Amino acid sequence: TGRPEWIWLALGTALMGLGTLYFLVKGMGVSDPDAKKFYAITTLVPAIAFTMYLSMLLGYGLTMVPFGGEQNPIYWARYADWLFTTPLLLLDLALLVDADQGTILALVGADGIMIGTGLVGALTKVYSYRFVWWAISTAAMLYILYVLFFGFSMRPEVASTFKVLRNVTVVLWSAYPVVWLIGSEGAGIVPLNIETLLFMVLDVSAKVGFGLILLRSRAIFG
Amino acid sequence: TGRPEWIWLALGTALMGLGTLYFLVKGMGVSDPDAKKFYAITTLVPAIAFTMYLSMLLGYGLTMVPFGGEQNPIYWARYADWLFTTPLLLLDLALLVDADQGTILALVGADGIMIGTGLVGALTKVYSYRFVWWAISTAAMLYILYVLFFGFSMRPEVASTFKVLRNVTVVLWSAYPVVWLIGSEGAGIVPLNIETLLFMVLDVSAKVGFGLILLRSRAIFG
Amino acid sequence: TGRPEWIWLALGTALMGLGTLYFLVKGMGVSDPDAKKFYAITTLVPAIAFTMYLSMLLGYGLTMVPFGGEQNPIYWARYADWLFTTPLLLLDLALLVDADQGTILALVGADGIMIGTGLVGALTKVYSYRFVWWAISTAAMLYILYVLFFGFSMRPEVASTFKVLRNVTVVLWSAYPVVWLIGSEGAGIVPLNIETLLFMVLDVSAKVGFGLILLRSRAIFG
Numbered sequence: 001t002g003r004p005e006w007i008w009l010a011l012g013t014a015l016m017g018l019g020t021l022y023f024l025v026k027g028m029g030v031s032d033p034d035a036k037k038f039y040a041i042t043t044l045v046p047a048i049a050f051t052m053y054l055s056m057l058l059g060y061g062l063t064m065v066p067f068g069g070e071q072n073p074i075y076w077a078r079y080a081d082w083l084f085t086t087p088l089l090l091l092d093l094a095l096l097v098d099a100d101q102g103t104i105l106a107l108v109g110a111d112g113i114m115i116g117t118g119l120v121g122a123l124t125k126v127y128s129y130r131f132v133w134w135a136i137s138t139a140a141m142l143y144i145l146y147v148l149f150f151g152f153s154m155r156p157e158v159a160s161t162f163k164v165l166r167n168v169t170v171v172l173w174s175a176y177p178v179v180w181l182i183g184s185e186g187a188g189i190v191p192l193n194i195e196t197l198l199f200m201v202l203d204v205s206a207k208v209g210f211g212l213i214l215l216r217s218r219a220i221f222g
Numbered sequence: 223t224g225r226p227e228w229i230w231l232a233l234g235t236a237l238m239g240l241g242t243l244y245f246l247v248k249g250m251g252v253s254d255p256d257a258k259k260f261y262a263i264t265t266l267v268p269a270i271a272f273t274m275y276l277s278m279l280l281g282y283g284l285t286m287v288p289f290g291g292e293q294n295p296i297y298w299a300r301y302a303d304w305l306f307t308t309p310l311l312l313l314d315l316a317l318l319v320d321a322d323q324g325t326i327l328a329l330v331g332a333d334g335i336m337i338g339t340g341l342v343g344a345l346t347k348v349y350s351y352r353f354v355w356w357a358i359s360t361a362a363m364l365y366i367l368y369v370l371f372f373g374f375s376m377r378p379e380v381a382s383t384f385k386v387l388r389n390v391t392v393v394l395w396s397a398y399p400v401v402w403l404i405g406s407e408g409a410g411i412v413p414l415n416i417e418t419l420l421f422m423v424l425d426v427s428a429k430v431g432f433g434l435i436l437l438r439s440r441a442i443f444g
Numbered sequence: 445t446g447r448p449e450w451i452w453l454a455l456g457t458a459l460m461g462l463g464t465l466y467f468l469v470k471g472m473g474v475s476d477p478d479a480k481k482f483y484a485i486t487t488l489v490p491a492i493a494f495t496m497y498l499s500m501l502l503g504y505g506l507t508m509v510p511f512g513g514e515q516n517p518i519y520w521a522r523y524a525d526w527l528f529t530t531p532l533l534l535l536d537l538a539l540l541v542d543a544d545q546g547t548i549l550a551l552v553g554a555d556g557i558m559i560g561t562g563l564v565g566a567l568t569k570v571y572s573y574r575f576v577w578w579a580i581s582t583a584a585m586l587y588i589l590y591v592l593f594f595g596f597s598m599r600p601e602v603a604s605t606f607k608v609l610r611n612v613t614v615v616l617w618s619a620y621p622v623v624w625l626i627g628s629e630g631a632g633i634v635p636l637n638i639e640t641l642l643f644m645v646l647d648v649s650a651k652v653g654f655g656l657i658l659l660r661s662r663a664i665f666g
């Protein structure tokens with residue numbers, strides 16, 4: 001299409017589609033109820049991302065937001081994705097370590113706040129206020145990372161896989177607020193097409209990369 | 223009103239209203255926690271459907287979608303209904319057979335995908351792409367039906383009621399993609415008023431019919 | 445700002461912000477998984493309310509709804525708040541008394557209905573029909589209050605705290621339909637700025653007041 005970022009939306013669509021079918025095939029067989037849990041969560045994440053990448057690709061998940069006196073192309077479908085996929089990702093971590101329900105409700109709700117205030121910031125028409133919402137969302141993100149490091153003595157295999165995915169998570173998720181801040185939603189330093197490339201690489205790694213690590217682990221079986 | 227389909231929206235409103243009050247009365251009494259579960263789920267389904275039928279009846283759940291160069295009347299409130307009532311229906315089936323949580327999360331999330339891509343398809347302004355979303359949604363539907371048949375040795379009474387509702391479910395839910403495809407959201411072969419009649423008959427059967435079968439069964443008690 | 449109600453939106457923002465940080469600090473320490481549950485729920489409630497008060501304050505959570513041939517300023521962000529915070533409040537009550545899951549699903553779903561039909565009523569452009577949605581929502585509210593009084597012999601300490609919060613809940617929640625009815629969403633008897641003051645006082649009491657009562661109780665510990 002006439003949108004230079006179309007290629008990264010097409011590649012993301014394809015890669016999420018392929019990871020979904022890979023994980024669906026892979027989880028064929030599985031009878032351990034525990035493993036079943038991780039397969040369901042982990043397959044749903046890129047299936048949802050597939051649909052929202054495709055909706056961006058076809059033009060549906062894009063809207064024009066006037067701010068700084070200009071019509072800014074905002075991809076809102078990313079927040080409908082993340083709204084569901086980022087808690088699912090947290091549930092995978094949480095189940096690995098047998099978290100208490102209170103800690104899981106803390107994580108999912110901080111996550112909701114993170115994404116929803118990101119969305120409000122994305123659609124806010126007063127430029128300066130966009131970054132107030134960014135800050136609040138970032139603070140929710142930092143709470144989540146805090147809990148992942150300080151909020152949890154288990155089978156060695158659980159701990160090891162949990163520690164790797166936790167590290168993957170902090171590194172990748174921490175990049176999203178930066179991208180947003182310097183990209184088209186924020187200061188407009190980085191053009192939309194490079195931004196969309198950046199988010200494609202992060203999303204595939206955080207979903208399909210993460211899930212390959214998890215689902216090859218015997219940490220997921222009782 | 224000046225909408226010929228108004229009569230089927232009024233009858234659906236009434237029938238869902240009546241089934242809700244019937245099931246509410248009926249579940250009066252119930253102390254078995256298990257039965258309580260099925261009554262809550264099963265009463266909520268047509269109560270939600272009541273509200274969305276009424277919102278269509280009064281004009282609120284209808285929007286104009288330009289496509290094939292025309293203003294197409296799309297009832298979006300059906301997807302707000304289904305978004306909640308179709309997972310609830312799946313939960314009823316799932317609890318009957320004591321499904322593993324992983325299988326329940328698979329079903330609810332495939333269902334979310336089904337309805338949400340149905341909604342995107344319903345509101346898409348590029349005619350051809352409407353049917354890409356239809357296909358993806360249908361494939362989610364076929365996954366759900368697959369799991370209901372191949373994803374689950376229990377008390378004979380559970381199995382029997384489970385098998386009847388499962389059959390009811392596959393037959394009725396399978397008709398929805400057809401109706402959408404030949405009706406006003408899709409190829410426009412069947413006029414909106416007949417379409418609305420068709421969806422009224424399916425919805426009442428899938429909700430109030432289904433629930434009468436379930437809630438008369440002693441399969442719902444421990 | 446040029447909106448007279450701005451001061452009560454600023455004070456509500458501040459008070460919800462402060463209660464969130466108070467409860468977050470307070471729950472620092474807590475290891476009892478049960479207590480952890482109540483802290484998560486109870487801290488999330490005013491954190492969510494903080495974000496929606498701030499979105500009203502900045503103008504984002506406000507839209508113009510034409511009815512009775514006039515552009516009525518409707519704060520829709522209250523329903524995005526309540527959609528999540530009112531079930532959370534019910535979950536706090538429900539967990540205190542060890543409710544059956546069927547009763548919890550009844551409460552959360554009646555609550556969803558309550559808020560969602562409130563939202564539909566708030567955005568309905570046919571004046572008379574606004575109050576049909578009000579009535580349906582009120583009837584959901586009365587079901588919830590009914591269940592809180594007649595739907596539940598435990599540790600004396602649980603019962604006592606449960607009875608106080610239950611009383612707090614019925615009194616405060618019952619005022620909301622009245623405010624809506626006489627205020628800008630309804631009959632327009634009470635100006636928007638006084639209405640916004642009223643909702644600020646109720647919300648802070650129902651969230652931050654309620655939570656102070658709960659989280660000082662040893663009813664929350666196993």
Ligand SMILES: *C/C=C(C)/C=C/C=C(C)/C=C/C1=C(C)CCCC1(C)C
Nearest residue numbers: 118134137138141173176177180206
């Ligand atoms: C599947 C995609 C994932 C794991 C995406 C994660 C997204 C975030 C961690 C987003 C964070 C943001 C903030 C902390 C600040 C404001 C903007 C956001 C929403 C991009």
Ligand SMILES: *C/C=C(C)/C=C/C=C(C)/C=C/C1=C(C)CCCC1(C)C
Nearest residue numbers: 340356359360363395398399402428
């Ligand atoms: C209470 C109403 C029920 C049980 C409705 C079920 C609706 C479906 C099974 C819808 C399926 C659709 C597709 C598979 C394709 C695209 C359009 C839909 C959403 C009508």
Ligand SMILES: *C/C=C(C)/C=C/C=C(C)/C=C/C1=C(C)CCCC1(C)C
Nearest residue numbers: 562578581582585617620621624650
């Ligand atoms: C945190 C805020 C709380 C506890 C707010 C509760 C709101 C209600 C109980 C709202 C009830 C309403 C009706 C019963 C009728 C129509 C309008 C509503 C949504 C204001």
